[PDB]
Design a protein around this ligand. Structure first.
Ligand SMILES: [Mg+2]
Ligand SMILES: [Mg+2]
Ligand SMILES: [Mg+2]
Ligand SMILES: [Mg+2]
Ligand SMILES: [Mg+2]
Ligand SMILES: [Mg+2]
Ligand SMILES: [Mg+2]
Ligand SMILES: [Mg+2]
Ligand SMILES: [Mg+2]
Ligand SMILES: [Mg+2]
Ligand SMILES: [Mg+2]
Ligand SMILES: [Mg+2]
Ligand SMILES: [Mg+2]
Ligand SMILES: [Mg+2]
Ligand SMILES: [Mg+2]
Ligand SMILES: [Mg+2]
Ligand SMILES: [Mg+2]
Ligand SMILES: [Mg+2]
Ligand SMILES: [Mg+2]
Ligand SMILES: [Mg+2]
Ligand SMILES: [Mg+2]
Ligand SMILES: [Mg+2]
Ligand SMILES: [Mg+2]
Ligand SMILES: [Mg+2]
Ligand SMILES: [Mg+2]
Ligand SMILES: [Mg+2]
Ligand SMILES: [Mg+2]
Ligand SMILES: [Mg+2]
Ligand SMILES: [Mg+2]
Ligand SMILES: [Mg+2]
Ligand SMILES: [Mg+2]
Ligand SMILES: [Mg+2]
Ligand SMILES: [Mg+2]
Ligand SMILES: [Mg+2]
Ligand SMILES: [Mg+2]
Ligand SMILES: [Mg+2]
Ligand SMILES: [Mg+2]
Ligand SMILES: [Mg+2]
Ligand SMILES: [Mg+2]
Ligand SMILES: [Mg+2]
Ligand SMILES: [Mg+2]
Ligand SMILES: [Mg+2]
Ligand SMILES: [Mg+2]
Ligand SMILES: [Mg+2]
Ligand SMILES: [Mg+2]
Ligand SMILES: [Mg+2]
Lengths: 246, 338, 109
RNA sequence: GCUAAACCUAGCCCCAAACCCCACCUUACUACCAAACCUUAGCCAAACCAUUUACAUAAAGUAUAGGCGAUAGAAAUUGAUGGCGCAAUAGAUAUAGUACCGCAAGGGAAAGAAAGCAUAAUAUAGCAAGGACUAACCCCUAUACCUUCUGCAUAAUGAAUUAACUAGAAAUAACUUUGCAAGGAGAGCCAAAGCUAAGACCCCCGAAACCAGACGAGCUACCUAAGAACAGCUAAAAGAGCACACCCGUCUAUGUAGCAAAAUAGUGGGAAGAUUUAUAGGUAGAGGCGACAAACCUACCGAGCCUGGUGAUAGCUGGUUGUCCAAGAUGAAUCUUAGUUCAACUUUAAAUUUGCCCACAGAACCCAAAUCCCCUUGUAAAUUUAACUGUUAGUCCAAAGAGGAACAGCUCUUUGGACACUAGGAAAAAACCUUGUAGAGAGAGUAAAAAAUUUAACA
RNA sequence: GCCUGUUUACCAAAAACAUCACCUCUAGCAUCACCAGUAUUAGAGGCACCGCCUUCCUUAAAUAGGGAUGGCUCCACGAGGGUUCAGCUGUCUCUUACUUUUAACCAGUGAAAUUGACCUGCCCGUGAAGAGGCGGGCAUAACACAGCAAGACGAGAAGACCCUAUGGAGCUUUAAUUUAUUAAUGCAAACACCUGCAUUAAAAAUUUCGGUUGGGGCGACCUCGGAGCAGAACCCAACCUCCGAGCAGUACAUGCUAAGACUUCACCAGUCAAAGCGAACCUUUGAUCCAAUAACUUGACCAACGGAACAAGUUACCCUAGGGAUAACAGCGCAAUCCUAUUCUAGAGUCCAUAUCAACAAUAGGGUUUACGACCUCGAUGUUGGAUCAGGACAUCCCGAUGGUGCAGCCGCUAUUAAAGGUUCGUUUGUUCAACGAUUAAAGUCCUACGUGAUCUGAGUUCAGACCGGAGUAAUCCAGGUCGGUUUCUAUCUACUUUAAUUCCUCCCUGUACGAAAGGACAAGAGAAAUAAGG
């Protein structure tokens, strides 16, 4: 422990104290590096490399729509809603070697990632999730054990509304009339011939899109999932039905 | 060190200490004039306005006359035989508006103690005469000398770089580039005591404004008050420095040349003993004779604007008065006969 | 009665002795007044510090000093010299090491 | 062979479970007469202090608050009988809240089943031993230990001695070893080889204090009620004289662990008064009371005592317990110089590649010794990465200087050496000289290493 | 000081406090003090009864004593503080005898502080600077018992005093921050009382006491920069020697960006800068937070200039924790100062250097003063004087023996040698000293922890009380004057406890030598005393 002084006595000043000189961590001006950090939205990246790897190893089935639930179940991505994760962002990394036809739903998508997905004959849509809906989507089984009716998926905040109503982002709230134009624009820009997915034998699968207020593909808001006896209780009260449809 | 003492001195402020010194000395010196001098010193100071000859001199003079000030200098040279300083009448306390940059780009006038202009007018600046200011670098008399002619050469010296920088500031403000850049203006920061060796019998007209007790400012400002108790040693050695500087000026002036010893103090010690001791020292250690020239005509000429103490045998003393709070100013004209 | 005078040293002087390899921008020497003058491929800052303008080897030489004519005091000093006298100064040069580029084959059109 | 030594259960600790005749508030333990509720403060941290701090899991030490600093700090949401205990200085304080101490509040025990001596004093000389020796001593060598210091035999601290008890608690990040691995983890969290688990690492005693709430005016200060005492003489209705009882405490001596935590003997002051004194009652702690001495308030009152906050705090002092080896030594800021943080140094582990020495060439005008720089060469180290304590306002010697007095075992800066490390020498000996890397030897060669000097006739 | 009284229980009994008397200020009034009172009353403060006006003497000697609203007047009193006549006395010169206690031995009973271990000597030297323990010498069988108090820096309280701590506490304030609480008012609120909000006070409450330097003062400094110390890369202190600055002038690309570098030994901060873009064709001070601005940007101090947002004096009534890392006495260094001795003669000395004295200086030596250093001791050692007892040096004051002399004799002056012995009593003063009185053969200079308080004393000084004078707003303070004021120790160890006189005067020689006289010897001897030692 040394010899005498505060250090042998065990009473040396706090960490960061500099003997009275204005400490380094206080003499530096305050700057908004981390202002609002806990309210910034975070999106876990999903590179096309990782997506192709998952598809190749069979952990993600491209024959069915790929949403956040399927990604998590295949363990392709780890979402932490409590840490302000708002979902998954597609990432162009691996685009030049992506060769999978997939119907994938994500929260953000880069232009190049959209281009790769569409060139392979697939469909990509950016879908928003509030923190609660995101938690339920990422871990549905715990939610089903909570014994609560499936809630409605909330709409994007005002700042995010334009993003999800824009067709260039394949927003899930965007006018579907503008989608062919945007897809043709990407095909022209990136020099590939747009494949007419309507002719594909999986066109129905590629078209399936959950309703903007729907969390799970085949389950409607307000239903209760009784896993114990493999049943789905549906409300019939007019007020409840109106609420869960609104 | 001994912390506890039986008795400690009253701890006067420097202003009060200066007042006590003045009361114990000038009271004896002046008898019944001391109360008037005291009240004048303690009251506000009357500032004269010296127009800048390097600016719109006629326009500025017109503006000042509109402000009702009159040029006391103008109606003095006539009897005494470019300088124009406007001062208000006796008793008037009107201030002068703060100086502002003029049309030419230089300050129209300098607000300075009208008493700190008599030494300049008594030195007798003749055209084409080389002029020295041994230590006078508060501006003032220096700028007055500058605003005398465009056919004259002048050097100004002061040990203090701060005061030299102040001279430079006022020069850039008032003197134009033409004169300031020209050799007409030569400023230096050297010791005047050795100026006799630095230059000897070179200058024709010298002005020696030795550092003084500056009684009015001593009573006014506490900062750097010469009468602070600690600086008694410097106060005591002031006479030696004053004598040395006057001797250096008398050595530097040419034979037959003229010097003006100047002071901003009432002290007979710093006024007449300085000049007499300088004469003695410079006539013995250097065998050079100097004659004190009479300024009684100068006194009568400027009696209207200033009040002068007559009992002073050598030199002239402008004492402050409530009617004309212009003093103090002691000045003595000395011609080097050898 | 003597105050002040506690200023620390400026740590000036040569930073690169002769033969030292110097990259562009490296300060070669910091001086208060011109002890060493800039030579070839050596620049001068506001504060009269010498820095390398090219990447090379630092050399110190003695060369005749001919000041800029607009340097009036130096010109007068020269004007007062005798006919045979020539002023000299110590100059710092950077002998550039690499060539400033090479021509490469890019495409065989 | 005495004193003594020892012993094992009396009980206790932490969990789990379970919700546990008569007398007596008057002076308590006495048979029987006409009214509660109301913010804690402060210590402490902030290196003072003044706002402030200080009375399931996960989200998350997040949002927030804050001399925006010390630090404080959510919620939405999630859903959840046993003993690697003690065993009579331990474990409860406990055989007992007893004895005992205190007026009181209050404090609060102990215990039951070797040392020291004696047998047998002692012999020149000496840290009490060691080398030895035929032999105890005699011979030679040898300046106790701890702590604090530049440096201690030091005439600096602590220790009579024995037994028992008595002092390093933990994170962040690392490193090591497993597991699994672009994933790890038994939800939450982390992840651009990570994640998970484990291993390793942060003392003891001590103030004067502050505040809260009690307890104290059986001493003492003053006061209230109702009592009592004051001979004799002199003087006459007395804050009168002398002088008993009584009260006090001037001076001296004694005593000073005492007869006494303020006494004794003599001497002395008052002794009908503002006197002394018994009884009961009152005033309570920032308060009372005070013929103000900072006097007194239960022996220690410039602010009582007890309990609690409290294991207060202490940059200050002291202490900090097995063996063995290894590496290891002299700037800046700071209410700061008795401290700390950063640097430098130091230690460990790791990476890869130059490191030191170093000639020539080279480094200024103004107005010496040397230094810097690096091809070789002698060498094997250096840099970087990770982690990190501690030392960090020293001494003397040689040298260049400054201050002082061309004093100081004096005070400063610089280069170097030595000391704080072994040994030999210079008498003893930190700092001068020789010399170092460790063991055994009843071998050998050496190093430094011992002061020298004696002196007045005269043509 | 009027008086009698009171007070620091346990170091101060006093001049301090009170006190009648007097003065000043405040109050016009009842049902719990004042007060069951009412201005001749009550409360508080000051002041001090009362009354009247505005160099000599003492001694023999005398640092003592007495006398030549304000200014005086002391009646009485006093364990107050000084001085004195006379007396008295063992206070003393100068101590002795006896009794009792204690004591020592015998018997019984039987502690305490203390204690590293000790097989515990002296001298010199050394050393953390003071040695029983180390070096060199000397001494040395072993043990009781009784004394002593020189040492064991002896034992007692983490002594006294001094310094430090971002340790306490007390006191005072024009230190800082508050007015919660009361008292006044004002504004609302209820129609005297009460609530809320403001302002001003009173009373208090909380908190702080920067740093470095300075012994005889009346402060200076604290940040930055230039020069020397520090000569030649860099770097280098100081109460070190000097100097300078807290910006201005200029322009308004004095813009934006960016390789690579420097760096005040850390960080913070601070510098330089190619290329590029854009216009054109510059030479020092300060952080964070906080505020203000729409923002760009800007501000206050933070000069104790790495910056507490806002806090001073004082403490001897003090306390705690420490410090010999830091003062005073003392020890130890040093020798400026001081003292001594030689060399030189300037010179004085009637001339005359050297009978004697001595300048400017030089060279040695000492460790007696005044200082300097901060090395030992701050985990019970005040200091000065005095008493007692002294050990030692000789640089000799007397006594002894000599040389010279400006020594005829006596006398001196000077020098050499000599440390065996000796070296007074009084007045003032606490005094060491000093002055004075009277002596003496002489009344020596010093060291010994300015020897010696476990032997004594406490008069000065030093602690708690109080005055005078002074400083300070006050609390308080003071190198000053004064009155008062607790001095513990039973001895374990070392050491020690029985080791051939000196002077003076008288006389003889002898009023002899010598000398003109005056004066006046030696050497030798006798007698008286006195002291010292031993009986
Ligand atoms: Mg320790
Ligand atoms: Mg330390
Ligand atoms: Mg310097
Ligand atoms: Mg604190
Ligand atoms: Mg919750
Ligand atoms: Mg027990
Ligand atoms: Mg035994
Ligand atoms: Mg010891
Ligand atoms: Mg100690
Ligand atoms: Mg002890
Ligand atoms: Mg009572
Ligand atoms: Mg009677
Ligand atoms: Mg009576
Ligand atoms: Mg009383
Ligand atoms: Mg008092
Ligand atoms: Mg007192
Ligand atoms: Mg008590
Ligand atoms: Mg503690
Ligand atoms: Mg080792
Ligand atoms: Mg500070
Ligand atoms: Mg400290
Ligand atoms: Mg009295
Ligand atoms: Mg008493
Ligand atoms: Mg009493
Ligand atoms: Mg008494
Ligand atoms: Mg007497
Ligand atoms: Mg009395
Ligand atoms: Mg007995
Ligand atoms: Mg000795
Ligand atoms: Mg000893
Ligand atoms: Mg004995
Ligand atoms: Mg102590
Ligand atoms: Mg640096
Ligand atoms: Mg500061
Ligand atoms: Mg500072
Ligand atoms: Mg020292
Ligand atoms: Mg001791
Ligand atoms: Mg002799
Ligand atoms: Mg002495
Ligand atoms: Mg006394
Ligand atoms: Mg006193
Ligand atoms: Mg006194
Ligand atoms: Mg006295
Ligand atoms: Mg007395
Ligand atoms: Mg005694
Ligand atoms: Mg005894």
């Amino acid at each position: 422990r040394g010899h005498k002084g505060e250090r042998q006595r065990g009473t040396r000043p706090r960490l960061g104290f500099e003997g009275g000189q204005t400490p380094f961590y206080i003499r530096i001006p305050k700057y908004g590096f981390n202002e609002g950090h806990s309210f910034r939205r975070q999106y876990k990246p999903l590179s096309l490399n990782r997506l192709q790897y998952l598809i190749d190893l069979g952990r993600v089935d491209p024959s069915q729509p790929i949403d956040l639930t399927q990604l998590v179940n295949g363990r392709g991505v780890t979402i932490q809603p409590l840490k302000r994760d708002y979902g998954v962002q597609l990432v162009e990394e691996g685009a030049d070697t992506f060769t999978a036809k997939v119907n994938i739903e994500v929260q953000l998508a880069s232009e190049l990632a959209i281009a790769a997905i569409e060139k392979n004959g697939g469909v990509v849509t950016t879908a928003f999730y509030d923190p609660r809906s995101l938690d339920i989507v990422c871990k549905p089984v715990p939610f089903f054990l909570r014994g609560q009716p499936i809630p409605k998926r909330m709409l994007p905040p005002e700042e995010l509304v334009p993003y999800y109503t824009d067709a260039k982002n394949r927003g899930y709230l965007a006018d579907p009339a503008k989608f062919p134009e945007a897809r043709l624009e990407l095909a022209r820009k990136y020099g590939y011939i747009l494949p007419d997915i309507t002719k594909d034998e999986l066109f129905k699968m590629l078209c399936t899109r959950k309703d903007p207020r729907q969390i799970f593909f085949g389950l409607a808001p307000g239903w209760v999932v009784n896993m114990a006896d493999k049943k789905i209780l549906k409300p019939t009260d007019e007020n409840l039905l109106k609420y869960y449809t609104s | 060190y001994k912390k506890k003492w039986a008795a400690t001195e009253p701890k006067f402020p420097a202003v009060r200490l200066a007042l006590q010194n003045f009361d114990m000395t000038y009271s004896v010196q002046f008898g019944d004039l001391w109360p008037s001098i005291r009240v004048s010193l303690l009251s506000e100071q009357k500032y004269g306005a010296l127009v800048n000859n390097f600016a719109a001199w006629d326009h500025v003079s017109a503006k000042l006359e509109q402000l009702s000030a009159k040029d006391f200098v103008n109606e003095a040279i006539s009897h005494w035989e470019n300088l124009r300083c406007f001062t208000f009448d006796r008793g008037d306390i009107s201030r002068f508006p703060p100086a502002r940059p003029g049309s030419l780009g230089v300050m129209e006038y300098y607000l300075m103690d009208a008493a700190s202009l008599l030494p300049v007018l008594a030195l007798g600046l003749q055209p084409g005469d080389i002029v020295l200011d041994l230590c006078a670098a508060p501006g003032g008399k220096t700028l007055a000398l500058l605003q005398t002619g465009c056919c004259r050469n002048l050097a100004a010296n002061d040990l203090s770089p701060s005061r030299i920088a102040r001279l430079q500031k006022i020069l850039h403000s008032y003197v134009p580039e033409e004169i300031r850049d020209g050799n007409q203006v030569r400023v230096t920061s050297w010791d005047g005591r050795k100026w006799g060796e630095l230059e000897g019998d070179t200058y024709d007209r010298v002005l020696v404004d030795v550092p003084c007790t500056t009684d009015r400012h001593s009573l006014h400002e506490e900062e750097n008050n010469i009468f602070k108790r600690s600086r008694k040693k410097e106060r005591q050695i002031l006479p030696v420095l004053q004598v040395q500087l006057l001797a250096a000026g008398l050595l530097a002036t040419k034979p037959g040349g003229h010097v003006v010893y100047s002071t901003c103090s009432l002290s007979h010690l710093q006024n007449e003993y300085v000049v007499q001791g300088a004469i003695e020292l410079l006539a013995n250690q250097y065998s050079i004779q100097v004659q004190v020239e009479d300024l009684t005509h100068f006194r009568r000429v400027f009696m209207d604007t200033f009040c002068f103490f007559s009992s002073c045998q050598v030199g002239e003393l402008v004492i402050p008065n409530l009617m004309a709070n212009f003093g103090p100013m002691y000045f003595c004209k000395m011609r080097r006969l050898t | 009665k003597n105050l002040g005078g506690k200023s620390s040293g400026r740590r000036q002087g040569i930073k690169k002795m002769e033969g030292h390899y110097v990259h562009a921008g490296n300060i070669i020497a910091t001086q208060r007044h011109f002890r060493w003058h800039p030579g070839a491929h050596v620049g001068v800052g506001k504060n009269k510090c010498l820095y390398a303008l090219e990447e090379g080897i630092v050399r110190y030489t003695k060369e005749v000093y001919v000041p800029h004519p607009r340097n009036t005091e130096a010109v007068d000093l020269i004007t007062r010299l005798p006919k045979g006298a020539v002023l000299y100064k110590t100059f710092v040069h950077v002998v550039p090491a690499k060539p400033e580029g090479t021509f490469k084959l890019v495409a065989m059109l």
